[PDB]
Amino acid sequence: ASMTDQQAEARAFLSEEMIAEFKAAFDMFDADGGGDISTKELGTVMRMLGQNPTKEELDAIIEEVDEDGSGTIDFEEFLVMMVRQMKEDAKGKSEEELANCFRIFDKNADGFIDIEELGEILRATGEHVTEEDIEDLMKDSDKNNDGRIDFDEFLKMMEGVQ
């Protein structure tokens, strides 16, 4: 995947109204209507659009897009950078939320989900789940056969592929 390749994939990832919205923000920093903005304003536009890159991350991006020393970033490269950041932030959010889901499921906080805690949470959903169904989930998820689900096994169970 080349940069233009990366650019077509960034556009395919977003709806067109989202892309127009992003450009509406981006254009407020252009001025010259060149289709580019100063690398010094990249962090500001990304934050305005809900992203939270670290300073180290911004420096890395700038270094990747400004090799000719023009001091600018164009809109197509900006979309690539936005999509990279959106993917990283969403995965961060998903990991944090799974850690909270686990602390909640583990009622006695012993660091493991046991069959009684698993059945209680599945039954509370209102679904017509049977004890066989709960036991089936426990066996398929308990990779070391200790009768319980630890956090590593919980992440694998939930992410599935995982």
Swiss-Prot record:
Residues the record lists as binding Ca(2+) 3: D106, N108, D110, E117
Q: Name one GO biological process term.
A: skeletal muscle contraction
Pfam families (alphabetical): EF-hand_7 (PF13499)
Write down the superkingdom of origin.
Answer: Eukaryota
Q: Which GO terms describe its cellular component?
A: troponin complex
One GO molecular function term? Answer: calcium ion binding
Sites of the modification Blocked amino end (Ala)? Answer: A1
Segments forming domain EF-hand? 17-52, 53-88, 93-128, 129-162
Binding residues annotated for Ca(2+) 1, in chain numbering: D30, D32, D36, E41
State where Ca(2+) 2 binds: D66, D68, S70, T72, E77
Which UniProt keywords are present, listed alphabetically? Calcium, Metal-binding, Muscle protein, Repeat
Which residues bind Ca(2+) 4 per the record?
Answer: D142, N144, D146, R148, E153
What miscellaneous comment appears in this entry? Skeletal muscle troponin C binds four calcium ions.
Q: PANTHER family from the xrefs?
A: MYOSIN LIGHT CHAIN 1, 3, TROPONIN C2, FAST SKELETAL TYPE
Main function: Troponin is the central regulatory protein of striated muscle contraction. Tn consists of three components: Tn-I which is the inhibitor of actomyosin ATPase, Tn-T which contains the binding site for tropomyosin and Tn-C. The binding of calcium to Tn-C abolishes the inhibitory action of Tn on actin filaments.
Per the similarity annotation, which family is this? Belongs to the troponin C family.
In its UniProt entry, what is this protein called?
Troponin C, skeletal muscle
Native species: Gallus gallus (Chicken)
Query: What does the record give as the organism's lineage?
Result: Eukaryota, Metazoa, Chordata, Craniata, Vertebrata
